[PDB]
Amino acid sequence: GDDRELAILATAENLLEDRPLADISVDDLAKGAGISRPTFYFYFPSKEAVLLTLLDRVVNQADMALQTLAENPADTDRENMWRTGINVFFETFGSHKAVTRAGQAARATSVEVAELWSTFMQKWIAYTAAVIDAERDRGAAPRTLPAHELATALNLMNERTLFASFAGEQPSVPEARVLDTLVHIWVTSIYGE
Amino acid sequence: GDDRELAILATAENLLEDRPLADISVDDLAKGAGISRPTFYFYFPSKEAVLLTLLDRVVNQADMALQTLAENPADTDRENMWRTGINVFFETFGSHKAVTRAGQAARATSVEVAELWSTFMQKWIAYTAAVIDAERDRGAAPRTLPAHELATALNLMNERTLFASFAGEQPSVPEARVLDTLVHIWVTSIYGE
Ligand SMILES: Fc1ccc2nc(Nc3nc(-c4ccccn4)cs3)sc2c1
Numbered sequence: 001g002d003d004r005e006l007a008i009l010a011t012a013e014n015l016l017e018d019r020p021l022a023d024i025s026v027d028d029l030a031k032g033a034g035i036s037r038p039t040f041y042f043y044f045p046s047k048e049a050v051l052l053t054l055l056d057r058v059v060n061q062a063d064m065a066l067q068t069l070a071e072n073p074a075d076t077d078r079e080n081m082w083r084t085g086i087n088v089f090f091e092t093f094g095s096h097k098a099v100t101r102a103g104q105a106a107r108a109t110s111v112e113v114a115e116l117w118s119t120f121m122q123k124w125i126a127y128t129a130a131v132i133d134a135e136r137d138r139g140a141a142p143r144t145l146p147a148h149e150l151a152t153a154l155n156l157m158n159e160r161t162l163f164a165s166f167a168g169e170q171p172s173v174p175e176a177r178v179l180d181t182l183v184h185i186w187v188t189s190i191y192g193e
Numbered sequence: 194g195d196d197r198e199l200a201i202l203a204t205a206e207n208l209l210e211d212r213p214l215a216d217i218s219v220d221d222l223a224k225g226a227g228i229s230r231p232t233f234y235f236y237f238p239s240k241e242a243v244l245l246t247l248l249d250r251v252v253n254q255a256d257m258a259l260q261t262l263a264e265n266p267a268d269t270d271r272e273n274m275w276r277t278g279i280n281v282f283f284e285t286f287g288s289h290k291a292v293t294r295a296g297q298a299a300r301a302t303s304v305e306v307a308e309l310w311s312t313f314m315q316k317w318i319a320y321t322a323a324v325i326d327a328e329r330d331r332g333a334a335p336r337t338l339p340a341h342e343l344a345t346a347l348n349l350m351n352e353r354t355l356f357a358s359f360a361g362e363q364p365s366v367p368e369a370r371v372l373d374t375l376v377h378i379w380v381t382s383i384y385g386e
Pocket residue numbers: 081082084085086087089090093121124125127128131154155158159160162163
């Protein structure tokens with residue numbers, strides 16, 4: 001039952017490490033999962049639904065890790081606070097580079113993927129803005145830009161920059177440098193002027 | 194001759210304001226340009242080549258405007274310097290929102306579009322880094338991050354944020370706010386700490 005579903009998911013994530021979703025057949029996923037093609041369709045309506053599920057698991061993994069941090073403030077300076085949070089996305093998505101790259105591509109063709117990404121980005125931006133607001137209330141950050149607009153640009157920067165690094169795009173920040181790069185821009189723009 | 198080509202280009206840009214390239218036929222472009230379908234193929238091998246040409250014109254328009262600024266330093270403070278430069282992209286791409294949105298989508302399917310965008314992004318990042326380097330040399334900016342890595346993240350932020358605003362994505366910064374938002378992040382991250 002659920003074993004077969006997890007096997008389909010594992011096959012898909014493994015095959016996506018070597019070629020795009022368009023070059024992966026339903027027969028490919030069935031074979032790698034040890035089932036027939038009609039048995040596959042019992043668990044998933046299409047290979048695109050498999051990717052949707054894989055991406056849903058990754059985004060919820062990142063969201064739950066961020067929720068854990070928010071309930072467990074690490075005892076450090078403000079710079080380290082932001083780094084620990086950005087690192088949740090660096091580590092979670094960087095551990096699922098194939099699903100991440102495939103999910104970004106599917107945003108152009110799948111309404112559910114686009115809506116899934118949009119829902120979680122709105123959640124993460126709202127949390128970023130709430131923390132900026134708290135920092136302003138306690139006197140640690142200046143009241144410069146509207147906090148939600150700042151949070152939006154910083155989160156969109158992280159999306160584009162992290163995914164360019166993971167995919168090895170040209171241009172991109174080297175993966176070994178991208179965390180320091182983003183943290184610097186977040187901290188100077190949140191606390192500067 | 195060139196009149197027919199410009200007519201095809203104008204028809205394509207007009208039709209892209211209402212539906213994606215996948216929903217525009219070669220017959221659509223021929224009809225709107227007042228020519229036959231075989232005559233169309235004399236000027237362009239495909240509708241994708243039409244988009245490639247449209248995007249090439251827009252990116253070169255932005256590049257030439259930025260080159261004009263670089264040769265004509267406006268007499269203002271450092272903040273205004275950066276704003277005037279970011280504004281080149283805000284105005285150029287914001288005046289061609291349909292071609293911009295279609296070109297971004299084609300990056301996933303067209304090697305020439307992806308290489309075109311990558312070439313000009315590398316050029317614009319190198320220029321950004323050169324200006325940051327000049328500001329550090331004259332003593333106006335601190336030596337914090339590697340300038341080219343900072344420039345990469347700031348330019349990728351601008352790409353993602355401007356295009357989200359133009360497309361009305363959720364989430365996005367309102368178009369009337371995106372210039373102030375980006376300028377703040379550039380100036381604080383280039384001159385801060
Ligand atoms: F402490 C905090 C509180 C909020 C907070 N928000 C963050 N930014 C985000 N990055 C992404 C993202 C997107 C695509 C790929 C990788 N990452 C989505 S939202 S980092 C952080 C740290």
